[model samples]
Each structure stands twice: as C-alpha cells, then as structure tokens.
Target chain A: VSLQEFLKTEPDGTLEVVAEQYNTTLLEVVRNLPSSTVVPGDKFDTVWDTVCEWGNVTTLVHTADVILEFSGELPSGFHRHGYFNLRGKHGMSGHIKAENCTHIALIERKFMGMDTASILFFNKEGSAMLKIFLGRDDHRQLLSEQVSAFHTLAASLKEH
Target chain B: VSLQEFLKTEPDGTLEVVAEQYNTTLLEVVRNLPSSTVVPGDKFDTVWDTVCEWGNVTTLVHTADVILEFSGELPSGFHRHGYFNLRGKHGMSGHIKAENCTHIALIERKFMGMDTASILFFNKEGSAMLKIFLGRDDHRQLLSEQVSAFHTLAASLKE
Candidate 1:
C-alpha cells in the first residue's frame, strides 16, 4: 500500500489500512523512537533537543493482554511497532514492535504524519503533560487531545 | 520511599522528583506512554487490558537517549516487577522490577489474579477499540468510561 497516498486521503481514526499498504518494510519509515520500556500509563516524552540523527523506537515486548492506548491523533507516517508514530526523525531511520493496541473513548485523530515517534505502556492512569522541542522554522501542528491513561492487566491488586 | 507522603508533600508537575522517587526506574515509565511518542501538545489515550500472574516481573532490558523529557508518579508498593493494581479491579497482586529498566522513562509492574482485569491504551483510534474481559462488573465500568467519554486517549486519536 502507498503510505504517502493513504496519509493524504485516509479518513480520521484509521491507520491499519495504511499499515497494510506499506507492509512491514515501512517499519523503518518511523525511524525508531529514542527511548526504551515504559510503565503503566506513564507519559513517554521524546523532545528533539538538538535534532540528532539517531532514530528512536520502543515496544511492549513480552507483555500479556496489555493494551497501548492513544489520547489523540497519531502523527503522520507514524509507524506501528509497539503502537504508532510518524515516519523518520531528522534523517534517521529505525523500527519498533508491539502487541495489540486500541483507542480509548473521547480522543480523536486524523491522518498520521511524517517524522513522528511513539511509546507503549502497560496500563492506564490520569492526565500527563507533554513537552515540545522543535526548531522555530519547524511548522508542525500537534493535536491538543486529552491525555491517554491506562491500567495494567493487574489493576485489581491496587484496591485489594 | 513513602509514595503517599511524596504525593502529599510534592507538588504537581514535578518531573525530576517524580523521576527520582521511583529511582530512575521511571525511565521505563516514560517509554511506556503515548506522551513520549505523540507530537508535542497533542493528547492521547492509553489503557491496560491484560491479565498477569503472581510473581511475574517486567524488567528493563536496555535503553537509548532520544528521550526529550520525562515525568510521572508511582503509587507506593508498586515496584518494577512487583505485583499490583489500580484500575478499580481487585484481587490482583504482583511486583515491579525497579532496577532492571533501561529507558529514560519506563514502567515495570507485575500482576497475579484470576477474576480481575483492567484496560488502558494510548493514542488509540476509535476503530481500534480495546476489548476488555473485565468480568461482568468490569464491563459495566469499561463501557461506562467508553460511553461517558471517559476516554482521554481514543477521542484524541480520532481526529
């Protein structure tokens, strides 16, 4: 499938079809994220401080019945390894892998974009803050959706 | 450390302190979130929909820099690989391996239970709804949260 085409015409809230178009090779299109493992519902941040060339990608490896939730529209070209992200990061390329993922209610999305990165969590939680670091010339528009929150497959132990 | 005490004395948005309280283990926490992946100022939904067994621990295998910023707070008794729960689901027990994680922001938790389950996701699209088998009662709340617009991640990803 043509990710470049799908990204332009694809409707909001659906990227799986695009994934089918690009096949798994596009996996590198996302250019890998810049971090590693994460907690349940912890806000993962990847601010490009110096515009480095190292691509970043993370995944929910070896997780059972775990879910990866997104609070807003994933950036374009966003690859779906542990979840989704934009393609490429400062001329760098890489890959990401993950289990299953689903969107919670309330959040909205549109066409995913280019040069994006994403993270995967094990559970759900409350609101989280995201910090941005882009050059002044960079005219990227990020969505302002509510924070994504989740719980682990073992959320029951909390009350008990 | 005292998580309850920290929540009481610490201020909101304290990323560094929150990072230290969990002792760098939070590096895994940050990696496990949509906040780290999504664009700046954008919001996403993340939920948990899995069942973990007792003594099961998730540890950090490795990590990289690419991390721009990170912050979060962990409930006490919850360590990397230590069994625990928070999604209103009860009877679960596990542990977190606070030491093994490598990412700048990552989470390590374990779970042990048969009847209880939870659901969480980040930057998920509506067409991609998380199927949760949270018993009969769990279904009610899960559906309610879904219907009541309780989803902070899904709604955002919907465009």
Candidate 2:
C-alpha cells in the first residue's frame, strides 16, 4: 500500500508502524513527508521555554516496549541540574541534557482529516527524545488553539 | 526531642527521621502534625482533577531508598488502568484502582521557614500513593500563586 493509503487507513498508528509499512527508517519517513521542515539549532532549552506558553500539549516518548503519552500543561518553572529541571503540578523531573540534542523539526500535516503540527526533537543517533503536538479537541481531533499556537512558534523559528 | 524542636533543628529532614525521632510510623508522624486537616471523601479523582487546575505542583513519592520529587504540571487527563493513568506532557501513566483509595488529607504548615501545602492521597492499606504540594518560589519559598490556588481548591472541597 502507498504511504497515503496506509495513512488514510490508520491515521493514529505509531511512527514505527508507518516506517515499517513503507520499509524505511523513522527518520527517513519523517524527512520525506510532505509539509515538513528541518528546524535548525541544538538549543533544546529555548525550544522548550518557548513552547511552555503554548499551554496544554501532548508529549509522546516511544521506548523499546512502551509508548509513554504525557499530555497536559508544559513545564512551568525551569532550572538547571546537570541537565535541565522543570517544576510544576505535573511531575516531569529529569536532566534534559541539551548536548545530546542533534536536530529539530516542524511537521505540519493532516492526521484524521484535521490539520496537525508536531515539534520533534531528535538525539545524535536519530531517535526522538520528545515530540510536542497539539492536544486533541473535545471531539478527539487536533485542537485548533494548539494548532494556531504551533504555527506561531513555527513562524517565529522561520523569522530567526 | 519534641517534634517541633526536631523540625526546627532539621527543617529539611525526611518523614522517616521525624518518625524515628518520635518513635512511630511515618503515617503517625503525618497524622499527628498540628496544622493538618482530614479532607473528606475518597474521591481521589476529584482531588487530582481539581488540583490540576491549580497549575504547577510538586509530587513527592517516597520509598525505602528513593524520594522521587516530580515537580511539573498535574495530570490533565485521568483514566483507570487498575493504577491511575495520567496523560499529558511530563507524562505519568499507570493503572489507578479507585477501590484501593482509602483517605485524603491536606497539610498546611511551615517547612524550613517556608509555608507549605501538601495534599496527600492514600490507599486502603494505609500507604500513600502520592503527595502533591505547591511549587517553590525564587527564594525557595512556596509560590504564593500555587499556595493561593491550593487553598482555593481545599476550600472548594470543604464546601
């Protein structure tokens, strides 16, 4: 099946599945997708700090066995502890070593028929450290408010 | 040493230190704190959801060897998976069985010269699953914004 057809059938499938269906690496799949741009910079902190203003966003972390889906407000207060530390009502405590960061990208595409935007951060080995996307709407579609906020961030990145 | 003076002498001590100082279980140590309140209802979901709106809060999970401090946004989306499932950024995911929930409480006091508010949740076996508190301010004080927000949620619970 073609990528478009597969996407149409399983809009919510994992990226690994998408890559496997198309017989490609996850990086190549994202790299070749339409409406995608490679955001330049290894400054993960700046990206995180800026996204906090976007309000509730969804974070998906795929591990070998599990896909951790942490959706809610972004980290509010940030400090440094070897890596970086974020404090707030939700507990996402860890050292986000900026040095390990290698690439950043913005993907504006359609998922389940609604416009979607995802800010992806990759490590040196081409694995995603984190993915920030607009939270789903009440009807379980991509939220417009978050989509608008995502575009605004994307636009800002382009200007700089 | 009295709990008060012991707290004064080691303002940053863990609950175990306080329990060992008082010769009791950690549960009793918290149970006897003067400024604490027994928040009614076993509606852990209500407490969690209400607090999420309160903004960035501190979550402290205790164990024999580790004191996990998870300070970030509260879980926005709540679901049951036997343990509680909290979805969203800074994701905390698990199955939370409401039936195991036993009690809830609010602790308002001073820790290391800073005012503190801790919302504690426990299971039927009387062990705390988690504790939530207001985030710290610049001077290491509890943020007035989070403190105020916590109290508002507490008050809403009382009503």
Best by lDDT: 2
TM-score of chain A of each: 0.23, 0.77
* Cα TM-score per model: 0.20, 0.48
Docking outcome class, model 1? incorrect
lDDT (C-alpha) at residue A48 in model 1 = 20
Model 1 Cα lDDT, one tens digit per residue, B27-80: 333333333322221111122211222111111111121111101111123323
Scanning candidate 2 chain A in windows of ten residues, the lowest lDDT window is A61-70
In candidate 2, position B149 carries an lDDT of: 73
What is every candidate's C-alpha DockQ against the true complex, given to 2 decimals? Answer: 0.02, 0.14
Give lDDT per model, in order: 0.25, 0.64
Off by over 4 Å in 2: A1-12, A22-24, A76-82, A112-115, B1-159
lDDT of 2: 0.64
| Least well predicted 10-residue stretch by lDDT in candidate 1 chain B | B65-74
